[PDB]
């Protein structure tokens, strides 16, 4: 039969902020959003930091946000999980780590990794935990092979990390630097194996040599070359030749993992996480499998669903919404609308929002949809320009589309949840009027277009799918630890 639709409408990069200064959200003329906001129940929810599985303080983002929305739970990221296992001790009881330690004592340990607190590919505090573990289980020879960042952190900051780590070597008693390589060598990913080789060699074959890590790095600086581009080198008398790789992101660790792996005998080789490097390694950390995301629950209650967005947020309403899964669920269909081909979207702030809107109206007119997941990309994609007037026009175009969409849903006696996945356009200028081109940490609005209900006064993205299921009168599975924003 024909169905009354329930729609989640994600205004990407659109959050609540008090001041109007650099606040495209407030300066925009958005009569439709404002009409719905004044008429219908509203609240505001957290989309950053620990509430979306990120470290405390970290702005949210589209990938994390769409995964938390779809999952109906906090989806904990790798960095957050590792940090928690250290704070809670699990790390030190880790079988693959205690195995590794036992193996070098029976043959009586190198450590590879990006040495910074960038948190994109690694974190050196995890190195500090490896050391401490080895100091508990009494390891004698620990050699640290350092890859220098300058890319996820300040361009010239390696000396700070090296100094803190040797202090740890001293405050702890074991460990030393055998080799030092800019990530431009040890963490290439564009199949540039001339660069990988220099790093392989430093780790003790033909390669530059210096008396300390500090010395080689300072030599690089004097030659105009910062941390990322540091030519690999050995630390004098400190590298006795040849293992744990504490990077947790595969794409930049794989090529070096393949050179090293692809002649030594009886080598224990572990990676913090499984890389696509084609070799047999012990894996320190296993992923959480996400099941019973909203798409799966819709499918298992025989509901039809639509995922729709233009190119820039199409992965987000498909792969990320479905919990890291490309395959459609049974009953699921999708509409991809091509984004404009421009280098930056301030050149066409309406992007393809009107074509997204028209495609949605086409699908709603079929009358066969239980569940709709729609994203309007514009506030985030234009707000990354740090330009106020383009981002205003982006929000105004979305607001006009939003009115046609929500009015049709309401005329089909359906329901909409209007929200966002994190902030951006709520601050496109700094307080000194410079461009502000990142996401924000601000909480996101929520409108539920059902009269006579009351919403909880706070929440998080993990609560949105429970709310949808509430409106659908569908049972919520245990895997979804979030809670519906509608009070009962």
């Amino acid at each position: 039969m024909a169905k009354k639709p329930t729609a989640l409408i994600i205004l990407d990069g659109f959050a609540n902020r008090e001041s109007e200064h650099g606040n495209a959200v407030k300066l925009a003329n958005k009569p439709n959003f404002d009409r719905y906001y004044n008429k219908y129940p509203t609240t505001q929810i957290e989309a950053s930091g620990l509430d979306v599985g990120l470290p405390e303080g970290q702005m949210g983002n589209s990938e994390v946000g769409h995964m938390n929305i779809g999952a109906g739970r906090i989806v904990y990221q790798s960095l957050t999980r590792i940090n928690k296992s250290i704070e809670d001790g699990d790390f030190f009881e880790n079988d693959v780590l205690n195995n590794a330690i036992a193996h070098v004592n029976s043959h009586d340990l190198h450590i590879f990794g990006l040495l910074s607190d960038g948190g994109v590919h690694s974190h050196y505090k995890h190195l500090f935990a490896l050391l401490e573990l080895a100091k508990k289980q009494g390891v004698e020879k620990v050699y640290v092979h350092a890859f220098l960042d300058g890319r996820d952190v300040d361009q010239k900051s390696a000396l700070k990390y090296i100094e803190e780590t040797e202090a740890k070597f001293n405050e702890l008693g074991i460990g030393q630097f055998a080799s030092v390589s800019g990530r431009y060598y040890a963490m290439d990913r564009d199949k540039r194996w001339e660069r990988e080789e220099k790093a392989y060699n430093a780790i003790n074959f033909d390669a530059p040599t210096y008396a300390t890590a500090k010395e080689g790095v300072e030599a690089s600086y004097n030659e105009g070359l910062t941390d990322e581009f540091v030519v690999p080198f050995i630390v004098e008398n400190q590298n006795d030749g040849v293992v744990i790789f504490y990077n947790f992101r595969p794409d930049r660790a794989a090529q070096l993992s393949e050179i090293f792996a692809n002649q030594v005998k009886d080598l224990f080789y572990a990676t913090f996480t499984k890389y696509n490097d084609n070799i047999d390694a012990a894996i320190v950390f296993e992923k959480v499998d996400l099941n019973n995301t909203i798409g799966e629950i819709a499918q298992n209650n025989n509901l039809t669903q639509l995922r729709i967005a233009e190119t820039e947020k199409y992965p987000h309403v498909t792969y990320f919404m479905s919990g890291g899964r490309n395959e459609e669920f049974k009953g699921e269909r999708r509409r991809l609308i091509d984004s404009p081909k421009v280098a930056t979207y301030d050149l066409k702030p309406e992007m393809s929002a009107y074509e997204v809107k028209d495609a949605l109206l086409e699908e709603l007119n079929k009358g066969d949809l239980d569940l709709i997941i729609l994203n309007f990309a514009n506030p985030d994609m234009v707000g990354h320009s740090g330009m106020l007037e383009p981002t205003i026009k982006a929000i105004e175009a979305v607001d006009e589309c939003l009115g046609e969409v929500v009015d049709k849903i309401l005329d089909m006696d359906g329901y909409a949840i209007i929200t966002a996945d994190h902030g951006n356009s709520d601050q496109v200028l700094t307080d000194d009027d410079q461009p502000m081109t990142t996401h924000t940490t601000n909480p996101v609005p929520v409108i539920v277009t059902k009269e006579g209900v009351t919403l909880r006064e706070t929440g998080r993205l993990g609560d949105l799918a429970p709310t949808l299921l509430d409106l659908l009168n569908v049972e919520q599975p245990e895997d979804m630890t979030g809670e519906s924003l509608i009070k009962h």
Binding site: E63, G119, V120
Partner: peptide, 14 residues
């Protein structure tokens, strides 16, 4: 995005 995977900073280095 594509170069990486969901559990390895898909918002960065793209």
């Amino acid at each position: 995005x594509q170069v990486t995977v969901w559990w390895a900073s898909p918002w960065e280095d793209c």
